[PDB]
């Protein structure tokens with residue numbers, strides 16, 4: 080009942096005993112594995128009791144005075160109000176834990192270094208925007224990026240939810256044409272149409288930074304222009320391909336996910352944007368080279384004078400590698416934090432070893448940890464992994480429409 | 481029924497075939513173990529009944545007299561003998577289905593084109609060797625490779641198994657060295673030691689073809705040398721890096737797995753080697769670049785004058801791509817069938833489409849289907865997949881020693 084886990088590069092063997100704590104059942108059954116799928120009232124107390132227990136064991140204070148006291152308070156709070164408020168230190172600990180528990184995140188070696196902004200006293204989309212602006216400016220830090228999350232008020236019954244409508248704080252417009260197809264980012268055609276619907280003046284470019292749609296409880300969303308000085312972007316050039324700059328490509332400094340639901344101790348935060356720094360394959364391989372994204376691969380290959388007439392020239396692979404080189408070179412020249420997929424996966428292996436000793440294993444989603452180029456060149460390819468759900472957690476949630 | 485999405489196009493299908501999945505895999509609702517490399521006459525009767533049903537469906541005779549006669553026949557034979565014998569046409573159908581059903585095979589567009597050699601009358605290790613030699617000759621076909629399987633006698637009560645001890649018919653020796661290292665292929669250290677212990681006089685090159693260790697029922701394994709002119713090989717050169725040829729690298733034409741068990745309608749064929757042709761990443765990325773295999777990546781990168789002191793130069797990715805180019809160029813120059821990972825994954829997408837129409841789905845293991853370099857440049861990266869076990873099947877089995 081404790082899965083054996085082997086690293087095939089070295090031959091080492093561990094057992095994941097932490098898996099025995101998995102709460103939310105995943106999508107797989109003994110008869111079929113669905114691991115490759117992107118998307119698969121007094122019980123609030125069991126999750127609260129559990130999470131409070133997590134907190135006190137973490138500080139070596141299980142079964143000691145303040146532990147018991149805190150247990151009664153949440154019990155009394157739920158009895159009196161049907162919910163409870165997290166202590167500040169508990170909110171901090173829970174945010175770090177939800178990051179630590181994210182099976183798809185290869186950057187979790189950093190999970191202990193996370194700046195948590197407490198926005199639980201927020202009210203109105205105007206307050207949200209100032210909070211989001213504080214976060215962006217702190218996280219960006221003139222290109223010396225710092226992991227951060229801003230936690231807006233939790234969900235309560237009978238009253239609407241705080242929501243950010245954009246999937247990220249920086250996104251880039253996607254405009255249909257005289258022919259359906261898209262100029263800009265095809266991943267954001269929908270929110271680009273929602274923004275224009277609510278009064279935004281669309282640009283014409285391929286890299287127009289979208290406005291924010293911020294939603295206070297039970298109000299229509301409100302458009303907000305982001306201060307252009309606050310959105311740090313990187314023009315893309317290549318160290319030796321002089322023409323690469325003339326392609327006019329750019330990407331933004333801060334990856335800040337703004338549509339996921341943060342769940343701690345049974346409480347739900349549908350507005351809790353978190354940010355870190357990019358792994359270069361996210362920009363260079365997925366965002367720029369996915370066929371349903373900017374799809375630039377063949378354009379770069381023509382410029383490199385590659386033989387695109389036959390797949391066996393590996394022109395796709397060569398063009399992709401140089402795009403990733405340009406992402407890394409450009410961010411480093413701009414002094415904007417970035418990590419290549421070799422360094423990131425080596426650090427994740429160290430993370431796995433740390434978590435083995437600390438908690439007896441680590442929930443990891445192989446298909447998302449292995450980078451989208453040069454998979455088997457990285458050590459995580461040869462590492463068997465066990466995927467399961469622990470709480471606190473970041474969860475996906477429906478769009479607010 | 482699981483909903484399956486393609487994220488490049490937006491397509492959506494439902495895998496109704498997974499509901500008929502017989503045997504059980506390693507995952508539960510609590511934890512996914514999809515990344516793990518290694519995951520009574522009444523029950524023999526029900527397996528056989530299901531396969532006969534499959535066979536008579538394929539020839540448009542479900543529910544016919546001949547169908548019922550065969551069901552009745554197999555029951556009578558199991559009652560009188562504890563087992564039964566496949567008809568020749570049933571064996572051919574069953575070998576093909578086992579390939580069709582293999583979730584980790586990207587080459588399955590080819591599944592209907594498989595030459596089946598019926599060696600179920602084989603009597604000894606010496607005759608086994610002759611059958612194997614003629615398989616290699618037919619399948620190699622002077623470089624115009626043809627898919628084939630040779631089926632040796634089934635497991636049966638009262639007698640030991642036929643077994644091929646070698647994992648493939650063509651393997652390079654791996655010699656433990658004087659300073660702990662391995663000369664040759666480190667994957668083959670164990671089988672190399674067994675060959676020496678069984679009378680083989682070892683070489684000391686990096687590409688010494690191993691002899692075959694062939695086991696007849698209730699016999700010790702017997703050593704057979706492959707005639708050197710039966711084993712077609714490809715010296716590796718690069719189309720523009722002329723020093724590459726001085727590495728002295730080679731690989732063989734014929735990938736022929738010889739240690740898997742073929743299961744058809746409850747009957748087990750522990751010796752049934754099958755062969756196809758290579759996908760270039762198997763050789764260029766895994767066999768030559770894995771740290772625990774030939775491990776040539778850094779040596780190639782240094783010769784390429786790449787900066788190997790920093791990961792962000794992507795020296796590993798650049799060297800790997802040119803090693804794969806060399807493999808593709810070398811096999812094409814030698815007129816030896818080979819398929820690149822772009823062509824192969826494109827043909828697998830057609831296979832999934834064919835199989836959705838034919839059977840309502842297709843068992844597929846995403847982590848094995850996605851190639852080990854350039855994953856998201858291929859269409860299969862963006863295809864959700866359902867992994868499950870159908871019979872007839874190829875199964876792993878313990879080593880005979």
Ligand code: HEM
Pocket residue numbers: 174178181183184185186187189193226227228353354355356357358361418423447473
């Ligand atoms: C500090 C540098 C970080 C790096 C380099 C990094 C890297 C990554 C990468 C490459 C992914 C893959 C997801 C995809 O490709 O769509 C990912 C996913 C994820 N990250 Fe991290 N990350 C970082 C920080 C953070 C932080 C600070 C948080 C939260 C506090 C976080 C939470 C998550 C979650 C929940 C996912 C799952 C994505 C999904 O399911 O769509 N990450 N990360």
Ligand code: HEM
Pocket residue numbers: 575579582584585586587588590594627628629754755756757758759762819824848874
């Ligand atoms: C004709 C060209 C073929 C191509 C291009 C091809 C390709 C592949 C590749 C790339 C793999 C993954 C190998 C690995 O990394 O371990 C694989 C696995 C597999 N192939 Fe195919 N193959 C071909 C023919 C065949 C044939 C003829 C059979 C059987 C009749 C077969 C049965 C299998 C099985 C059972 C596996 C999975 C075994 C495992 O998990 O290690 N293949 N194939």
Ligand SMILES: CCN(CC)CCc1cc(F)c(F)c(CCc2cc(C)cc(N)n2)c1
Pocket residue numbers: 117246334335336339353354355356357358361
């Ligand atoms: C599931 C389907 N898609 C959305 C349509 C997922 C896209 C997505 C959704 C996330 F929540 C998410 F965190 C990511 C990772 C991006 C990222 C985040 C951080 C903090 C650092 C970093 N380097 N990278 C991607």
Ligand SMILES: CCN(CC)CCc1cc(F)c(F)c(CCc2cc(C)cc(N)n2)c1
Pocket residue numbers: 517587647735736737754755756757758759762
């Ligand atoms: C996980 C266990 N290991 C060995 C112990 C893998 C064994 C194994 C089992 C296969 F079926 C398999 F196809 C391979 C790749 C070789 C190959 C074979 C064919 C027919 C075509 C092709 N292109 N390549 C390796």
Ligand SMILES: C[C@H](O)[C@H](O)[C@H]1CNc2nc(N)[nH]c(=O)c2N1
Pocket residue numbers: 114115116117446447448487861862863864865
């Ligand atoms: C179908 C497949 O699961 C899907 O394309 C996944 C695969 N792995 C991934 N891995 C990361 N990091 N990000 C992704 O978007 C995906 N997409």
Ligand SMILES: C[C@H](O)[C@H](O)[C@H]1CNc2nc(N)[nH]c(=O)c2N1
Pocket residue numbers: 087460461462463464515516517847848849
């Ligand atoms: C641990 C992981 O499952 C293992 O390294 C797998 C991943 N995917 C693979 N895919 C193929 N085709 N061949 C392999 O050997 C592997 N190895």
Ligand SMILES: [Cl-]
Pocket residue numbers: 334361366
């Ligand atoms: Cl992104």
Ligand SMILES: [Cl-]
Pocket residue numbers: 735762767
């Ligand atoms: Cl091989």
Ligand SMILES: [Gd]
Pocket residue numbers: none
């Ligand atoms: Gd030119």
Ligand SMILES: [Gd]
Pocket residue numbers: 720721722
């Ligand atoms: Gd040259």
Ligand SMILES: [Gd]
Pocket residue numbers: none
């Ligand atoms: Gd040398």
Ligand SMILES: [Zn+2]
Pocket residue numbers: 107108111112113114507511512513514
């Ligand atoms: Zn699974």
